[PDB]
Enzyme design. Sequence first.
Site, PDB file in Angstrom:
ATOM      1  N   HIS A  59     -31.250  14.339-122.118  1.00 10.91           N
ATOM      2  CA  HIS A  59     -30.673  14.685-120.823  1.00 10.91           C
ATOM      3  C   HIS A  59     -30.709  16.183-120.532  1.00 10.91           C
ATOM      4  O   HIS A  59     -30.250  16.589-119.459  1.00 10.91           O
ATOM      5  CB  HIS A  59     -29.242  14.145-120.717  1.00 10.91           C
ATOM      6  N   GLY A  62     -22.241  22.186-123.652  1.00 14.18           N
ATOM      7  CA  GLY A  62     -23.268  22.793-124.469  1.00 14.18           C
ATOM      8  C   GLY A  62     -23.249  22.399-125.928  1.00 14.18           C
ATOM      9  O   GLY A  62     -24.099  22.878-126.689  1.00 14.18           O
ATOM     10  N   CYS A  73     -23.938  19.453-127.092  1.00 15.22           N
ATOM     11  CA  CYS A  73     -24.895  18.391-127.367  1.00 15.22           C
ATOM     12  C   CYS A  73     -26.029  18.912-128.240  1.00 15.22           C
ATOM     13  O   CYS A  73     -26.410  20.085-128.173  1.00 15.22           O
ATOM     14  CB  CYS A  73     -25.449  17.816-126.066  1.00 15.22           C
TER      15      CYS A  73
HETATM   16  C1  LIG Z   1     -23.763  17.957-123.872  1.00 17.94           C
HETATM   17  N1  LIG Z   1     -23.863  19.183-124.253  1.00 17.94           N
HETATM   18  C2  LIG Z   1     -22.493  17.438-123.224  1.00 17.94           C
HETATM   19  C3  LIG Z   1     -21.334  17.399-124.224  1.00 17.94           C
HETATM   20  C4  LIG Z   1     -19.971  17.213-123.553  1.00 17.94           C
HETATM   21  C5  LIG Z   1     -19.460  18.385-122.731  1.00 17.94           C
HETATM   22  C6  LIG Z   1     -17.953  18.185-122.723  1.00 17.94           C
HETATM   23  N2  LIG Z   1     -17.722  17.509-123.995  1.00 17.94           N
HETATM   24  C7  LIG Z   1     -18.816  16.947-124.500  1.00 17.94           C
HETATM   25  O1  LIG Z   1     -18.875  16.299-125.555  1.00 17.94           O
HETATM   26  N3  LIG Z   1     -22.717  16.131-122.627  1.00 17.94           N
HETATM   27  C8  LIG Z   1     -22.809  15.975-121.301  1.00 17.94           C
HETATM   28  O2  LIG Z   1     -22.690  16.907-120.507  1.00 17.94           O
HETATM   29  C9  LIG Z   1     -23.076  14.555-120.808  1.00 17.94           C
HETATM   30  C10 LIG Z   1     -24.365  14.517-120.003  1.00 17.94           C
HETATM   31  C11 LIG Z   1     -24.002  14.298-118.548  1.00 17.94           C
HETATM   32  C12 LIG Z   1     -22.506  14.074-118.456  1.00 17.94           C
HETATM   33  N4  LIG Z   1     -22.043  14.163-119.848  1.00 17.94           N
HETATM   34  C13 LIG Z   1     -20.788  13.945-120.274  1.00 17.94           C
HETATM   35  O3  LIG Z   1     -20.514  13.981-121.471  1.00 17.94           O
HETATM   36  C14 LIG Z   1     -19.728  13.649-119.213  1.00 17.94           C
HETATM   37  N5  LIG Z   1     -19.086  12.381-119.520  1.00 17.94           N
HETATM   38  C15 LIG Z   1     -19.432  11.260-118.888  1.00 17.94           C
HETATM   39  O4  LIG Z   1     -20.368  11.174-118.120  1.00 17.94           O
HETATM   40  C16 LIG Z   1     -18.566  10.024-119.143  1.00 17.94           C
HETATM   41  F1  LIG Z   1     -17.343  10.347-119.536  1.00 17.94           F
HETATM   42  F2  LIG Z   1     -18.440   9.284-118.051  1.00 17.94           F
HETATM   43  F3  LIG Z   1     -19.086   9.245-120.079  1.00 17.94           F
HETATM   44  C17 LIG Z   1     -18.692  14.771-119.013  1.00 17.94           C
HETATM   45  C18 LIG Z   1     -17.769  14.418-117.845  1.00 17.94           C
HETATM   46  C19 LIG Z   1     -19.398  16.092-118.693  1.00 17.94           C
HETATM   47  C20 LIG Z   1     -17.836  14.964-120.268  1.00 17.94           C
HETATM   48  C21 LIG Z   1     -24.837  13.277-119.276  1.00 17.94           C
HETATM   49  C22 LIG Z   1     -26.294  13.206-118.872  1.00 17.94           C
HETATM   50  C23 LIG Z   1     -24.247  11.918-119.585  1.00 17.94           C
END
Ligand SMILES: *C(=N)[C@H](C[C@@H]1CCNC1=O)NC(=O)[C@@H]1[C@@H]2[C@H](CN1C(=O)[C@@H](NC(=O)C(F)(F)F)C(C)(C)C)C2(C)C
Lengths: 299, 291
Positions: free
Chosen positions: B39, B140, B142
């Site tokens: 992603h 960040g 991930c």
């Molecule tokens: C990657 N670096 C991040 C890690 C996140 C940031 C906050 N805590 C974490 O573990 N992952 C993401 O940004 C992914 C990415 C888009 C949205 N996302 C999420 O983790 C979001 N959660 C959801 O979409 C949920 F809760 F519905 F499952 C967020 C709201 C930013 C925490 C994609 C492509 C899924």
Amino acid sequence: GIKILLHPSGVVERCMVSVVYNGSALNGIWLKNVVYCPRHVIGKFRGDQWTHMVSIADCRDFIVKCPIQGIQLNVQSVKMVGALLQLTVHTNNTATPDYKFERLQPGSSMTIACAYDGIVRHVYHVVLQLNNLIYASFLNGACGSVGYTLKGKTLYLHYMHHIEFNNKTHSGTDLEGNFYGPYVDEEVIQQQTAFQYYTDNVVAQLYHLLTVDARPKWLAQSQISIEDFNSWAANNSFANFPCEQTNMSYIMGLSQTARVPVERILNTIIQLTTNRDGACIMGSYDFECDWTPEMVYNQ
Amino acid sequence: IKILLHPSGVVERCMVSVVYNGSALNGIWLKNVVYCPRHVIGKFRGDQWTHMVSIADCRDFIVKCPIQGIQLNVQSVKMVGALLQLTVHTNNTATPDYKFERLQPGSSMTIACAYDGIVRHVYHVVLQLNNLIYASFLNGACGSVGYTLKGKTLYLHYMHHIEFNNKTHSGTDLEGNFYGPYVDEEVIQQQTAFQYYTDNVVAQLYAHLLTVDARPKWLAQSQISIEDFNSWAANNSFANFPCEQTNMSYIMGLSQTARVPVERILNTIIQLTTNRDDFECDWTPEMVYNQ
Ligand SMILES: *C(=N)[C@H](C[C@@H]1CCNC1=O)NC(=O)[C@@H]1[C@@H]2[C@H](CN1C(=O)[C@@H](NC(=O)C(F)(F)F)C(C)(C)C)C2(C)C
Ligand SMILES: *C(=N)[C@H](C[C@@H]1CCNC1=O)NC(=O)[C@@H]1[C@@H]2[C@H](CN1C(=O)[C@@H](NC(=O)C(F)(F)F)C(C)(C)C)C2(C)C
């Protein structure tokens, strides 16, 4: 989430060395051109025999190897500093970070790099207790392992292991060679001051409220004043609150997030001493001093 | 008896930063391949990923290894599962012997939480039976990996992708397949109902018996048979005991040291039900027994 956070061990792994002397083997840390190690590697001496035995020790009997860098080190000089040995070696460690020897106060945490034969095998988290002991995990050959923290690129060395007592408690020195509390590196029976909870950290443990259950059934409905708690604490092995005035800003911040004043937390502690009945709080079955207010607040 | 974590140095030497058109996260650099979550190229869904990957210009993947002071150049891009495999011109000299090993629920691992390709924190998690981990990550984070070590062999189990509303976290193994039915999409996803990993609950109670208080007062006074526990477990969110037959040797050894039979522990688990009306499965019987 709120987790127990360990400092990454890479910078310490590359400075660890093994120190073997006439059948005795343990660990040391190699900073600049000096290897620091516990002095008992050259024998189980007592009292004031150390200065003479160190003056007699043959430098060529110190076999020092840094396993990750794969090189053997040659000891040119030996100098006892406190209960530590300072073996000056020929080669400067190019992996030496910016470091500082910093003594821990009770209630503060550090990451233990528990090594064997100069190699870090496990890392784990401890807090210096009010009895100046740590509840760690060590076997034979683990001495010389260090406890440390990191702030940016600076390595803060706080601890080097020496001894384990009958109740699986552990004691050592700071890196300037002075023991925590009154314990010494001898096989004699040594007195231990009675255990006492570091109240600030137990409070940080209950503040569970932020990750597990915001309104648990064991959380007291009524408050007790700090002063009334401190009169109770003197008879119930809890330290006077607050143990550190600087923790009050963290605790006040946690109280606003959890919407629960610390006075309710303190009264919860009192009730739990007679009401707990096996309740599991922040994943533990007893009061734990591992959660500091700073780590719980900052993460 | 402590929660034991694995040293992070070998992982630290392999982490990289991956930035793609303003989207920043982490990757791990093994041999000549950087593995990162897909992603980073954008928020797509379902079967869009294949085509969107093939039009991503490799020159847009800015990859730096901050520990080694290196900036890598991506030659080609391949999607394996939900991961990108970025082939780089340079082979990572710090590469260890590694294995991509899938975790079973109830097993532990060490998380190297990283930002900008630099490991910041290291903490411990157990994969739960809902196939989620209860970790801690910010924007960040991930590309952070979960690992164990057997000597100097690096076993990679997890790479982080997503955080759900209840601060659960999900990701893939290093083969690119998710744990459980979760995907890397910003939508509501149903969760497996929680279930206690009974082997670890037993292990934690023994660890408490062997350190703090042997024979506390909330300890059950009477036994319950394994079979009678499993009939209770089926209706009370506890997995069938034992969860792993290989855990029985550890558990029986702990029962002998504490001199408390596992039948008493299982009955204690039952009587503690009122207290529960979490984080109870973080101690595995291997970690407790071996140390
Ligand atoms: C990657 N670096 C991040 C890690 C996140 C940031 C906050 N805590 C974490 O573990 N992952 C993401 O940004 C992914 C990415 C888009 C949205 N996302 C999420 O983790 C979001 N959660 C959801 O979409 C949920 F809760 F519905 F499952 C967020 C709201 C930013 C925490 C994609 C492509 C899924
Ligand atoms: C150094 N590598 C070891 C580390 C120990 C070994 C078991 N667990 C540990 O943490 N340190 C020692 O072997 C020191 C050393 C002689 C004896 N010793 C002890 O730790 C012993 N303890 C005591 O004598 C006691 F109880 F008084 F503290 C031992 C029985 C081996 C645990 C010297 C010079 C003190």
